[PDB]
Design a protein around this ligand. Structure first.
Ligand SMILES: O=C(O)c1ccc(-c2ccc([N+](=O)[O-])cc2Cl)o1
Ligand SMILES: [Mn+2]
Ligand SMILES: [Mn+2]
Ligand code: NA
Length: 263
């Protein structure tokens, strides 16, 4: 059931969302050529635990081995931090974070371009973040989630990219994943009219090539079937009386934290 968060819970969600975003702001200086994804994960975990006094919702979830998910280039999601995996110039890397604090979850991720960027890499990431932004600008009471999914897809496909169908955004609160499902493409099964108090994520996964994906034998790593690049950005938001409030905004975001549609 889609729950409406109380003002009190929403504040707890702001706290958790801020922490999740700060993990990403903290890790920035470390995302450099030569660094291992394994070390990046250890830095985030130490920060979450020793500094934020929070916990990673990913650790142990369905047996997931690390504190954050780190996906590089062709890897679509659930990449596993590994000490032998080194970042290099041109890489596009997603670091996905979910922390629990005072019982509530903050879920967010962003792409990082390592060293000297590649134009195609920058473009994929830019378009992906823009697809998230256009969706955020649509969130307000009364709108149907299907309209947002359709808009994300239209935009992405127009750029010659594709949207991954296997994964979606989700309601969030005392639980990591709660109703409703937030598809990033058009579907007849989607009929969710938004209302104030609802909290959920928007996190499109976009492939530069075809939408098809495959999972590696490690049981976790998901890559694009055609080995094209894939990018993802995610934000946790709360629907307000006249729009929405992004709970995981970072200083590098270029969209307002509070979006209002009132005159
Ligand atoms: O941002 C998210 O929702 C997210 C990051 C990684 C996951 C996740 C989802 C489902 C499973 N699973 O084993 O079904 C594992 C993870 Cl780490 O979800
Ligand atoms: Mn996430
Ligand atoms: Mn999520
Ligand atoms: Na990727």
């Amino acid at each position: 059931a889609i729950s409406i968060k109380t003002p009190e819970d929403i504040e707890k969600m702001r706290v958790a969302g801020r922490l999740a975003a700060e993990v990403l702001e903290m890790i920035e200086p470390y995302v450099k050529p030569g660094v291992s994804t394994g070390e990046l994960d250890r830095i985030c975990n130490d920060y979450i635990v020793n500094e934020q006094h929070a916990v990673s919702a990913c650790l142990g979830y369905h047996g997931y081995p690390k504190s954050v998910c780190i996906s590089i280039n062709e890897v679509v999601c659930h990449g596993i931090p590994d000490d032998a995996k080194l970042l290099k110039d041109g890489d596009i890397v997603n670091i996905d974070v979910t922390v629990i604090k005072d019982g509530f979850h903050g879920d967010t991720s962003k792409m990082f371009i390592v060293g000297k960027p590649t134009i195609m890499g920058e473009r994929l990431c830019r378009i992906t973040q823009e697809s998230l932004y256009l969706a955020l600008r649509m969130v307000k009471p009364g709108i149907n989630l299907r309209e947002i999914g359709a808009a994300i897809q239209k935009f992405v496909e127009a750029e010659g990219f594709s949207v991954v169908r296997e994964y979606c955004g989700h309601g969030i609160g005392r639980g990591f994943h709660e109703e409703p499902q937030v598809l990033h493409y058009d579907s007849r099964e989607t009929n969710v009219v938004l209302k104030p108090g609802m909290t959920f994520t928007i996190e499109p996964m976009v492939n530069a090539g075809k939408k098809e994906i495959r999972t590696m034998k490690d049981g976790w790593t998901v890559k694009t079937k055609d080995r094209s690049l894939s990018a993802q950005y995610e934000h946790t938001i709360v629907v307000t009386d006249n729009g929405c409030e992004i709970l995981t905004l970072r200083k590098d975001d270029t969209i307002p934290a509070i979006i209002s549609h009132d005159e």
